[PDB]
A paper describes a structure:
affinity to HpSPHb as to previously measured native, cleaved HpHb. mean square deviation of ∼0.5 Å. complex onto that of porcine HpHb.
haptoglobin forms a stable complex with a haemoglobin dimer. Trypanosomes take up this HpHb complex but not the individual components.
Residue numbers in the entry:
A (entry chain B): 3 to 146
B (entry chain C): 148 to 406
C (entry chain A): 2 to 142
């Protein structure tokens, strides 16, 4: 999975993320870049333009929760399946979310990290984060 | 015996576009794999025969291969990854116009909640604006063959609109290859187009061979109205192009009666 | 197909990229190779080490092709016909790879031009690169 070197570059970067902001910015961008996803979030209210989306407080708040789940995944790279089993079941059975979108959100997250960190978001740190997004996506798809 | 799925497709949100196959609503759907590992669709139409397209059948073959060359190079599954063995393939005799083949299995499948044929219609359900459901194993928004089944809910579109989109004009001497994806569908009086202008989940590579299914609410039965032919639109071009099942019905019935 | 508004977003964002296009191309390939090692198998003849001059050269050609697509957004299939045959028929590049390189270009732009990488511009570019990727794969067989 992650060399210990990669684990290290990852948690090093994560420790600097604005926990209150990057989750809302990733979710916010998912909804603007892949607009078909908005149908899942009618209880968030106004998503009708990119500013509406990016300034919506429910997007920001739900974003925090998504980021928090990625924080959980970081703590448990060895058991992403168990860690995400309940969430996988919710997204599948209750929400009917196509599992392709887990990878899209992941990737949008990577884009946001690159956006905030610039040059520190080097190719090798990207590569390690790509392992993490894939691992989180597979685990979220696992109960499908 | 056909067209009565245990768990018929029933999306929570009636929004034209993509949906997850949450309930397992397409037991007629099969998965074909070519000798160079490309996933495509086929559609179970009775206990022993499937429809698919001629282009699907030709993947990784010379444009001179025969049904006998093709048949032993295919792999086919139904239900929960159940390999079924093929006895033969029958190409439509005018497959450059009607993009179709039939597949005969060496034995009948046993029907259950995950494996069941769709009915072939005698009625022409392809009125412009008719809402159907197209399931498929094609590539998704990451260009990966989907791990889980998904469908698109879509209307039949105006034939002239679709012709102008891909060919610029209905008039033969004014036609030019205008396809937004750089390959041209087979379009004629034997086909219909489906879709709407929307940035969406669309059908894409590998979805061909799958059915445009219509639910006849009076009979409460599901029918294959089209077989998807042009699976290359992928939300860049605006329409999928489907072979009209009513236009091949007689050929299908004769073929099955003969083999 | 891209809306007028998308095309305007793409033309402006890529006009700002300007002479950086090569470097950004090269970095996107470098990210792709390291994040998704299977992509390296299409380039067994390359020096793929960090800072390889052969990669910078190729990044420049990739950039020029995208510039040409951007210049001819209403006629992309035609402008890319030679490339589309190259990728789909001769090289047989699996479609998945185009989404990998597309993502890595986006990452590279975000890291280099954060002021230009707004949500709307991100959406328009993703759509543009998904149109390029589709044109380059529709002939894949
Ligand atoms: C890696 C990707 C994702 C993660 C970590 C994630 C995580 C979560 C979390 C932690 C919650 C709150 C669950 C709870 O309260 O028990 C949630 C809810 C939800 N997620 Fe996701 N999710 C992901 C992807 C997606 C995607 C792609 C969609 C839709 C396109 C989606 C739609 C939802 C919806 C609709 C809810 C319910 C929210 C509400 O009721 O207010 N998720 N997700
Ligand atoms: C936006 C996507 C892409 C664009 C615009 C692009 C463009 C090009 C261009 C301009 C060439 C050079 C053609 C020449 O010198 O005549 C080329 C060659 C090539 N491309 Fe791509 N390409 C893209 C994606 C990919 C991807 C995803 C792969 C593989 C993972 C790939 C693999 C190749 C290879 C192997 C060559 C041949 C290299 C050589 O000449 O030795 N391309 N591409
Ligand atoms: C296959 O096509 C055969 C020939 O097509 C017919 O004759 C040619 C010259 C054209 O005039 C064409 O438009 C006509 O359709 C048909 O005679 C034959 O019925 C077709 N077979 C099936 C099974 O559909
Ligand atoms: C919804 As329409 C016929 O303009 O594609």
């Amino acid at each position: 999975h992650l060399t210990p070197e990669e684990k290290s570059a990852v948690t090093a970067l994560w420790g600097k993320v604005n926990v209150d902001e990057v989750g809302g910015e990733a979710l916010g961008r998912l909804l603007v870049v892949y607009p078909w996803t908005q149908r899942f979030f009618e209880s968030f209210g106004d998503l009708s333009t990119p500013d509406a989306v990016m300034g919506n407080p429910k997007v920001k708040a739900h974003g925090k929760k998504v980021l928090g789940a990625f924080s959980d995944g970081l703590a448990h790279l060895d058991n992403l399946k168990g860690t995400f089993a309940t969430l996988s079941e919710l997204h599948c059975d209750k929400l009917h979310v196509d599992p392709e979108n887990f990878r899209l959100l992941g990737n949008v997250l990577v884009c946001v990290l690159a956006h905030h960190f610039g040059k520190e978001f080097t190719p090798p740190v990207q590569a390690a984060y790509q392992k993490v997004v894939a691992g989180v996506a597979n685990a979220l798809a696992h109960k499908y | 015996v056909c067209g009565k799925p245990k768990n018929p497709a029933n999306p929570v949100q009636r929004i034209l576009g993509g949906h997850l196959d949450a309930k397992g609503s397409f037991p007629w759907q099969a998965k074909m794999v070519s000798h160079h590992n490309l996933t495509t669709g086929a559609t179970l139409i009775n206990e022993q025969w499937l429809l698919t397209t001629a282009k699907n059948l030709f993947l990784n073959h010379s444009e001179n291969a025969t049904a006998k060359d093709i048949a032993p190079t295919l792999t086919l599954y139904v239900g929960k990854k159940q390999l079924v063995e093929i006895e033969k393939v029958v190409l439509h005799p005018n497959y450059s116009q009607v993009d179709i083949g039939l597949i005969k299995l060496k034995q009948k499948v046993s029907v259950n909640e995950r494996v069941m044929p769709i009915c072939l219609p005698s009625k022409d359900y392809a009125e412009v604006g008719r809402v159907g459901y197209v399931s498929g194993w094609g590539r998704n928004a990451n260009f990966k063959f989907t791990d889980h089944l998904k469908y698109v809910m879509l209307p039949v579109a105006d034939q002239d609109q679709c012709i102008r989109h891909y060919e610029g004009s209905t008039v033969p001497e004014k036609k030019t290859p205008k396809s937004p994806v750089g390959v041209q569908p087979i379009l004629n009086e034997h086909t219909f187009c489906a879709g709407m202008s929307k940035y969406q989940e669309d059908t894409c590579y590998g979805d061909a061979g799958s059915a445009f299914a219509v639910h006849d609410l009076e009979e409460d039965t599901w029918y294959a109205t089209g077989i998807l032919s042009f699976d290359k639109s992928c939300a860049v071009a605006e329409y999928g192009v489907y072979v009209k099942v009513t236009s091949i019905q007689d050929w299908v019935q004769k073929t099955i009666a003969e083999n | 197909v891209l809306s007028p508004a998308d095309k305007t977003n793409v033309k402006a964002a890529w006009g700002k990229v300007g002479a950086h296009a090569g470097e950004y191309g090269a970095e996107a390939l470098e990210r792709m190779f390291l994040s998704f090692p299977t992509t390296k198998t299409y380039f067994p003849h390359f020096d793929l080490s960090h800072g390889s001059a052969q990669v910078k050269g190729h990044g420049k050609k990739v950039a020029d092709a995208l510039t040409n697509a951007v210049a001819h957004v209403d006629d992309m299939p035609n402008a890319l016909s030679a490339l589309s045959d190259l990728h789909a028929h001769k090289l047989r590049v699996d479609p998945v790879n185009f989404k990998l390189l597309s993502h890595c270009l986006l990452v590279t732009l975000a890291a280099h031009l954060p002021a230009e990488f707004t949500p709307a511009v991100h959406a328009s570019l993703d759509k543009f690169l998904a149109s390029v990727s589709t044109v380059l794969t529709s002939k894949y067989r």
